[PDB]
Amino acid sequence: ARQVTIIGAGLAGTLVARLLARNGWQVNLFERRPDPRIETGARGRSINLALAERGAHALRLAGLEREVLAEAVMMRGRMVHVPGTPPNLQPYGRDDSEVIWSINRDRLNRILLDGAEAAGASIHFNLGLDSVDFARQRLTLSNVSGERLEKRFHLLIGADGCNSAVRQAMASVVDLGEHLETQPHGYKELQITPEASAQFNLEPNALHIWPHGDYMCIALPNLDRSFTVTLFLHHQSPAAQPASPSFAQLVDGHAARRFFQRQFPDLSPMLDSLEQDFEHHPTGKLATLRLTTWHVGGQAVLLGDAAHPMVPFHGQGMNCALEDAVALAEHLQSAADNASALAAFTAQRQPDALAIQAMALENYVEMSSSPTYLLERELGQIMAQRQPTRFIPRYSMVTFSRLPYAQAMARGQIQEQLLKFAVANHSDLTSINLDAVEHEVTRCLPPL
Ligand SMILES: Cc1cc2nc3c(=O)[nH]c(=O)nc-3n(C[C@H](O)[C@H](O)[C@H](O)COP(=O)(O)OP(=O)(O)OC[C@H]3O[C@@H](n4cnc5c(N)ncnc54)[C@H](O)[C@@H]3O)c2cc1C
Ligand SMILES: [Cl-]
């Protein structure tokens, strides 16, 4: 039986552990944090995420989709809150087949942990990877106190998140060709109680957005009708605009309250613990990191956030990591040797990871901030009705299909240019020749 060591019992790490163990691999998984299934007196984490077709299909192959969706809230559409006008639901698709699921992160992690152990994997908690000696095939782990433990390894999988210790150890034996692009936005997690959401009639089966240009708020529902709110705001005010809002200008919780009362007046009354949450929850950091190399021969490989950190403006990070886990287990199972598998996995997944990283950065302007946009959207809806197998909106290709990310991006660019050109010198749809646009659709877009 083939042997494998995995670092990180997160979302990608636990899924890949189950897929390999059920195929007869001898699997050992190491996690820095304690086992979350061991109940303590401490408060549970209220963090949630948007699960789409890519992530759901990966769970379906693993035999875990039913268990996960049993505790997921259906999001049928987007609820945009702009002051003055009441919110109106913008449905994602034709029916409840085209939806996104809101799931508690800790609940998903516990289901995955149970799944990896049921398949035969051994999980070791309270052990963080410190360093790797590739030539001697040994690694060093330690608990929070710093007490060290050495282990021999054969194949190493880096599923240890955006600040990966496996990636740091690899950078010493190979040039990874790393390119980091910092993000000016920070984030803060806040809460809406079940009592407050019900009092203010906040729709439970939708994803909520409070757009405000350079900054914004999003809210995802929980099973108990509570909501997890995320504020996206610049860490620092720029030199060009010194008076602009930023985290630096929000010295305490009282400062945060006055800011919300002024910029988000319909959201502020729903945030009862705004002051406490602002001061106790730390500000998170965002970035895009691109690597030319994801592996070291047949010895080590990276996947998920360890391989491709991305901005969270498309809700596809977890979805991508689960898709990576399926591809890695498939390559390792059927290759001539581990070196061949790691090279082929890297070649297949790298162009897709670059495509989703670029699409996530582009999606920020869509969520946070036109007469020309509405005409393009109207013509795009008609083209999708005439040719539903050729004209599929980019958001729909990413979120509701398994088309490779690079293909979704390429087809999306063809459609965006087709719509832009068609409306360019026209006041309204009555002056636009619909059959001529349809001809461009059939000429430039093959059926799927
Ligand atoms: C604000 C925000 C919102 C998001 N919303 C969404 C969303 O709606 N939909 C979506 O698809 N994605 C979303 N994402 C992205 C998503 O959270 C991540 O992409 C995903 O968790 C990555 O999975 P992973 O397994 O690669 O890493 P992780 O889930 O981060 O797991 C890494 C694991 O490794 C462990 N670890 C770290 N270092 C070590 C070490 N040295 N030794 C041992 N163990 C270690 C960690 O404790 C952790 O358990 C969001 C991200 C952010 C920041
Ligand atoms: Cl994301």
Side-chain angles (χ1 to χ4, degrees), residues 78-90 200-203 206-211 266 270:
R78 168 194 273 216
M79 199 70 72
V80 179
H81 301 256
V82 166
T85 37
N88 267 320
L89 187 81
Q90 293 176 30
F200 293 89
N201 304 285
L202 198 71
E203 176 57 46
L207 192 137
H208 295 261
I209 307 146
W210 287 262
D266 322 308
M270 294 194 278

Short mmCIF file of all heavy atoms in Angstrom, two decimals, residues 78-90 200-203 206-211 266 270:
data_model
loop_
_atom_site.label_atom_id
_atom_site.label_comp_id
_atom_site.label_asym_id
_atom_site.label_seq_id
_atom_site.Cartn_x
_atom_site.Cartn_y
_atom_site.Cartn_z
N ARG A 78 -29.88 37.23 -5.03
CA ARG A 78 -29.16 38.35 -4.42
C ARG A 78 -30.16 39.46 -3.99
O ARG A 78 -31.09 39.78 -4.74
CB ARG A 78 -28.10 38.83 -5.44
CG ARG A 78 -27.43 40.15 -5.15
CD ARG A 78 -26.70 40.64 -6.40
NE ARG A 78 -25.34 40.11 -6.49
CZ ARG A 78 -24.30 40.79 -6.97
NH1 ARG A 78 -24.46 42.04 -7.39
NH2 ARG A 78 -23.10 40.23 -7.01
N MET A 79 -30.01 39.98 -2.75
CA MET A 79 -30.84 41.05 -2.21
C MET A 79 -29.92 42.27 -2.01
O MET A 79 -29.11 42.27 -1.08
CB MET A 79 -31.50 40.59 -0.89
CG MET A 79 -32.70 41.42 -0.47
SD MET A 79 -34.19 41.21 -1.51
CE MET A 79 -34.72 39.56 -1.00
N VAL A 80 -30.00 43.26 -2.95
CA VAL A 80 -29.17 44.47 -2.96
C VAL A 80 -29.87 45.56 -2.14
O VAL A 80 -31.01 45.92 -2.43
CB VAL A 80 -28.81 44.95 -4.40
CG1 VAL A 80 -27.97 46.23 -4.37
CG2 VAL A 80 -28.08 43.87 -5.18
N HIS A 81 -29.19 46.06 -1.10
CA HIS A 81 -29.77 47.08 -0.22
C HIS A 81 -29.12 48.43 -0.51
O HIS A 81 -27.97 48.66 -0.15
CB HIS A 81 -29.62 46.73 1.27
CG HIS A 81 -30.24 45.44 1.69
ND1 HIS A 81 -31.43 45.41 2.40
CD2 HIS A 81 -29.80 44.17 1.54
CE1 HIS A 81 -31.69 44.13 2.63
NE2 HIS A 81 -30.72 43.35 2.14
N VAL A 82 -29.86 49.29 -1.19
CA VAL A 82 -29.45 50.66 -1.46
C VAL A 82 -30.48 51.60 -0.77
O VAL A 82 -31.69 51.41 -0.96
CB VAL A 82 -29.22 50.96 -2.97
CG1 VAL A 82 -29.15 52.46 -3.25
CG2 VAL A 82 -27.95 50.26 -3.48
N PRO A 83 -30.01 52.53 0.11
CA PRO A 83 -30.96 53.39 0.84
C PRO A 83 -31.90 54.19 -0.04
O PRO A 83 -31.49 54.67 -1.11
CB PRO A 83 -30.05 54.31 1.67
CG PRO A 83 -28.75 53.59 1.76
CD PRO A 83 -28.62 52.85 0.47
N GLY A 84 -33.15 54.26 0.39
CA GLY A 84 -34.22 54.94 -0.32
C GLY A 84 -35.18 53.99 -1.00
O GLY A 84 -36.39 54.21 -0.93
N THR A 85 -34.64 52.93 -1.65
CA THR A 85 -35.43 51.91 -2.37
C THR A 85 -35.54 50.58 -1.61
O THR A 85 -34.55 50.17 -0.98
CB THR A 85 -34.90 51.71 -3.80
OG1 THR A 85 -33.47 51.82 -3.81
CG2 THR A 85 -35.50 52.71 -4.78
N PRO A 86 -36.73 49.90 -1.63
CA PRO A 86 -36.85 48.63 -0.91
C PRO A 86 -36.06 47.53 -1.61
O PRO A 86 -35.84 47.64 -2.82
CB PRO A 86 -38.36 48.35 -0.90
CG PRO A 86 -39.03 49.55 -1.50
CD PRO A 86 -37.99 50.24 -2.33
N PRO A 87 -35.57 46.48 -0.89
CA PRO A 87 -34.82 45.43 -1.60
C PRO A 87 -35.75 44.56 -2.47
O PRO A 87 -36.87 44.25 -2.05
CB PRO A 87 -34.15 44.64 -0.46
CG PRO A 87 -34.49 45.34 0.83
CD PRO A 87 -35.69 46.19 0.55
N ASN A 88 -35.30 44.16 -3.66
CA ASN A 88 -36.06 43.28 -4.56
C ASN A 88 -35.16 42.11 -4.95
O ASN A 88 -34.04 42.36 -5.39
CB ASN A 88 -36.56 44.03 -5.81
CG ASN A 88 -37.95 44.62 -5.72
OD1 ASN A 88 -38.89 44.01 -5.17
ND2 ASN A 88 -38.14 45.79 -6.31
N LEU A 89 -35.60 40.85 -4.76
CA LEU A 89 -34.76 39.68 -5.07
C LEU A 89 -34.40 39.58 -6.55
O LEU A 89 -35.30 39.67 -7.39
CB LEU A 89 -35.41 38.36 -4.60
CG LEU A 89 -34.50 37.11 -4.73
CD1 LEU A 89 -33.53 37.00 -3.56
CD2 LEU A 89 -35.32 35.84 -4.88
N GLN A 90 -33.10 39.40 -6.85
CA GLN A 90 -32.60 39.16 -8.21
C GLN A 90 -32.28 37.63 -8.30
O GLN A 90 -31.20 37.22 -7.86
CB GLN A 90 -31.34 39.98 -8.50
CG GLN A 90 -31.58 41.49 -8.57
CD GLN A 90 -30.29 42.26 -8.75
OE1 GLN A 90 -29.32 41.78 -9.35
NE2 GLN A 90 -30.26 43.49 -8.27
N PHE A 200 -36.58 42.99 11.56
CA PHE A 200 -36.33 43.84 10.39
C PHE A 200 -36.66 43.13 9.05
O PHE A 200 -36.38 43.69 7.98
CB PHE A 200 -34.90 44.42 10.43
CG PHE A 200 -34.71 45.41 11.58
CD1 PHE A 200 -34.28 44.97 12.83
CD2 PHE A 200 -34.99 46.76 11.42
CE1 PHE A 200 -34.14 45.87 13.90
CE2 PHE A 200 -34.84 47.65 12.48
CZ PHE A 200 -34.43 47.20 13.72
N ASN A 201 -37.32 41.95 9.11
CA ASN A 201 -37.80 41.16 7.95
C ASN A 201 -36.72 40.85 6.91
O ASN A 201 -36.98 40.90 5.70
CB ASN A 201 -39.01 41.86 7.29
CG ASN A 201 -40.16 42.11 8.22
OD1 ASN A 201 -40.90 41.20 8.59
ND2 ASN A 201 -40.33 43.36 8.62
N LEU A 202 -35.50 40.53 7.38
CA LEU A 202 -34.39 40.20 6.48
C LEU A 202 -34.62 38.79 5.89
O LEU A 202 -34.76 37.83 6.66
CB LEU A 202 -33.06 40.32 7.24
CG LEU A 202 -31.79 40.43 6.41
CD1 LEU A 202 -31.70 41.79 5.71
CD2 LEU A 202 -30.57 40.22 7.27
N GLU A 203 -34.76 38.69 4.55
CA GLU A 203 -35.02 37.43 3.83
C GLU A 203 -33.98 36.31 4.13
O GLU A 203 -32.80 36.45 3.80
CB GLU A 203 -35.14 37.66 2.30
CG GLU A 203 -35.33 36.38 1.47
CD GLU A 203 -36.52 35.49 1.81
OE1 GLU A 203 -37.63 36.03 1.99
OE2 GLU A 203 -36.34 34.25 1.89
N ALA A 206 -31.57 34.10 0.74
CA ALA A 206 -30.87 34.99 -0.18
C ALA A 206 -29.51 35.42 0.36
O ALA A 206 -29.28 35.36 1.56
CB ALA A 206 -31.72 36.24 -0.43
N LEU A 207 -28.63 35.86 -0.54
CA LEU A 207 -27.33 36.44 -0.20
C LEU A 207 -27.58 37.95 -0.24
O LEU A 207 -28.10 38.45 -1.24
CB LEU A 207 -26.25 36.03 -1.22
CG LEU A 207 -24.80 36.34 -0.81
CD1 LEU A 207 -23.87 35.15 -1.15
CD2 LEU A 207 -24.30 37.59 -1.51
N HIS A 208 -27.24 38.67 0.85
CA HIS A 208 -27.48 40.11 1.01
C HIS A 208 -26.23 40.96 0.77
O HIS A 208 -25.17 40.60 1.27
CB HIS A 208 -28.07 40.41 2.39
CG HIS A 208 -29.44 39.83 2.61
ND1 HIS A 208 -30.58 40.60 2.47
CD2 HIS A 208 -29.80 38.57 2.94
CE1 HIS A 208 -31.60 39.78 2.70
NE2 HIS A 208 -31.17 38.55 3.00
N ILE A 209 -26.37 42.09 0.02
CA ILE A 209 -25.26 43.03 -0.28
C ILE A 209 -25.65 44.49 -0.01
O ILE A 209 -26.71 44.93 -0.43
CB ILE A 209 -24.69 42.84 -1.72
CG1 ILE A 209 -24.28 41.38 -1.98
CG2 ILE A 209 -23.49 43.77 -1.98
CD1 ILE A 209 -24.47 40.95 -3.35
N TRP A 210 -24.75 45.22 0.68
CA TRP A 210 -24.85 46.65 0.95
C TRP A 210 -23.68 47.29 0.19
O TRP A 210 -22.58 47.40 0.73
CB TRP A 210 -24.78 46.97 2.47
CG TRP A 210 -26.02 46.60 3.23
CD1 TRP A 210 -27.05 47.43 3.59
CD2 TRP A 210 -26.36 45.30 3.73
NE1 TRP A 210 -28.01 46.72 4.28
CE2 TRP A 210 -27.62 45.41 4.36
CE3 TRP A 210 -25.73 44.04 3.69
CZ2 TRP A 210 -28.25 44.31 4.96
CZ3 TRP A 210 -26.35 42.96 4.30
CH2 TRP A 210 -27.60 43.10 4.91
N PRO A 211 -23.86 47.59 -1.13
CA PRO A 211 -22.75 48.19 -1.90
C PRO A 211 -22.52 49.66 -1.53
O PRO A 211 -23.47 50.38 -1.22
CB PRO A 211 -23.20 48.03 -3.36
CG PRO A 211 -24.72 48.04 -3.29
CD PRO A 211 -25.11 47.50 -1.94
N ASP A 266 -29.59 51.47 7.20
CA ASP A 266 -30.58 50.39 7.30
C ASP A 266 -29.98 49.10 7.91
O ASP A 266 -30.73 48.22 8.35
CB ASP A 266 -31.25 50.13 5.93
CG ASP A 266 -31.51 51.38 5.10
OD1 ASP A 266 -32.12 52.34 5.63
OD2 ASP A 266 -31.07 51.40 3.92
N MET A 270 -29.68 46.47 12.99
CA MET A 270 -29.66 45.01 13.08
C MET A 270 -28.39 44.48 13.77
O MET A 270 -28.36 43.30 14.12
CB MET A 270 -29.78 44.36 11.68
CG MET A 270 -31.10 44.60 11.01
SD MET A 270 -31.38 43.54 9.56
CE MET A 270 -30.49 44.46 8.35
#
